[PDB]
Design an enzyme around this catalytic site. Structure first.
Site, short mmCIF file in Angstrom:
data_model
loop_
_atom_site.label_atom_id
_atom_site.label_comp_id
_atom_site.label_asym_id
_atom_site.label_seq_id
_atom_site.Cartn_x
_atom_site.Cartn_y
_atom_site.Cartn_z
CB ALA B 20 83.47 61.86 36.32
CB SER B 21 81.73 59.65 40.50
OG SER B 21 82.90 60.11 40.39
N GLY B 22 78.89 58.95 38.18
CA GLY B 22 77.47 58.56 38.21
C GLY B 22 76.46 59.72 37.89
N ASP B 117 90.42 63.59 43.83
CA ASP B 117 90.66 64.27 42.39
C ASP B 117 89.79 65.65 42.59
#
Ligand code: 9WS
Ligand code: 9WS
Lengths: 257, 251
Positions: B20-22, B117
């Site tokens: 989700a973050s790269g 998260d």
């Protein structure tokens, strides 16, 4: 950067002691054992060390910046120093070859990391080489047996590494017979080194010849005739492939409580 | 300070995850002679259970370099049942303990990193199956966060249920919006003999922790300190040799 309040350090019991006194403490908030060294600025020096983040260098968790008390906080290494593993023969009657080679590999990795830094140890010894929960190497930097001659009469660390290699493979104290440290310094300046024979280094040693050559070249009187850390890694990497990953875990389990 | 790593020092760049973050990819550092992971405030955070940031790439690309975790995510361990037919209790109880340690560290920071998260896919497993949180599906999200902090404890309680069960939190539920609906209505993953067997060591203490942790009311949820104080006795119940035995058994 971060600043740890000294009152957060509970049950401050003694570990080792000069540079300062290293004591084990339980962090009140973190609920983990830490190690704290009392120091006699240093904050600038400590900051350089905080930039150094590598798997084989001891992590600096924070700094105590009280007026009465100043100190460095690191992780607590539950299996002590490499000195303790090699010599406390009552606690460690057997130390398996895969683990001994793994330690040598990891020291060379750690030292080579420090050498490639911007800007690029200080004095490397078995007492500075700490062993984590799983017997992985964590070097803790800022006895004359590890000191090269030219430092008492750049390629300093390789000299120390050679003595550490001789000590790891032998489990013998480098200059056992020698009492006065000045006699050690003398003999060394005269080209003398810890003995290489069947008694010091038995024939059961895996890759004995390959090891002997590395030690001998590493502790050469001429600093220019001493290999690099890259070359050590290049020489150990084949010997490391000789063992399966499961044997390292089996070696450690043979030491665990 | 944080060191700058030249993109050219990263050899054999092979895909790992996305993420989700790269996009995360493994690489070999030319100088360090080690495997690293590169993804296309955090540097201050140095703790045994947080994934260590080795450096940053700035070649104009803007990537984060961390240590390579050879045993992947916690999600993989709990669910890859053919690869991991058995995951011993000491190791499970150790994973949980080290997550609580890591999260509690972030909570005590200056300033705290409560803006996390937490999920089983973020919880990485080192060479010896020790935890390394890399907090930089809706099943871990507390209800109150559905529409734009006791957030982490909610996630931790779902992760705890998932670790002890090796079950997927809402297996029967197909649509993730229906998960969000039931959860908002107070529904949680089932607690019975089938989901959580009676063979579970300290079952009652663990059930209480999960149930209180995933409470509808954030104020009725415990502190990570309350988890640590509850787990520390449980972990003294095992010998150090059983943790390594548990790990060797994963081969
Ligand atoms: O020496 C340690 N840490 C350290 C090193 C340099 C400067 C400051 C600190 Cl606090 C240390 C950590 N665990 N441990 C276990 C046994 C013996 C020594 C240690
Ligand atoms: O996610 C990883 N690193 C990371 C995390 C956050 C930001 C940047 C980076 Cl590079 C990572 C390391 N090993 N590994 C193994 C499998 C899957 C993911 C990873």
């Amino acid at each position: 950067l971060p600043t740890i309040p000294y009152h957060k350090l509970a049950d401050l019991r003694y570990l080792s002691r000069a540079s300062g006194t290293v004591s084990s403490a339980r962090h009140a908030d973190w609920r983990v054992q830490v190690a704290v060294k009392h120091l006699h600025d240093v904050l600038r020096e400590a900051e350089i060390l905080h930039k150094a983040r590598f798997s084989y260098i001891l992590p600096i968790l924070g700094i105590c910046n009280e007026p009465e008390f100043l100190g460095i906080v690191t992780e607590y290494m539950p299996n002590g120093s490499l000195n303790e593993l090699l010599h406390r023969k009552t606690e460690y009657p057997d130390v398996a070859w895969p683990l001994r080679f793994r330690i040598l590999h990891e020291i060379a990795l750690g030292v080579n990391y420090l050498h490639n830094m911007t800007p690029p140890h200080h004095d490397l010894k078995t007492q500075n080489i700490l062993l984590d929960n799983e017997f992985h190497v964590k070097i803790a930097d800022f006895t004359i047996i590890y000191m090269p001659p030219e430092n008492y009469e750049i390629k300093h660390d390789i000299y120390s590494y050679a003595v550490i290699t001789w000590e790891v493979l032998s489990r013998k104290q480098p200059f056992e017979d020698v009492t006065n440290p000045l006699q050690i310094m003398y003999s060394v300046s005269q080209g003398h080194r810890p003995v290489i024979n069947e008694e010091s280094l038995p024939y059961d040693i895996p890759h004995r010849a390959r090891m002997i050559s590395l030690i001998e070249s590493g502790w050469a009187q001429n600093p220019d005739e001493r290999p690099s850390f890259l070359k050590c890694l290049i020489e150990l990497e084949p010997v490391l492939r000789t063992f399966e990953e499961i044997t390292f875990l089996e070696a450690v389990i043979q030491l665990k409580k």
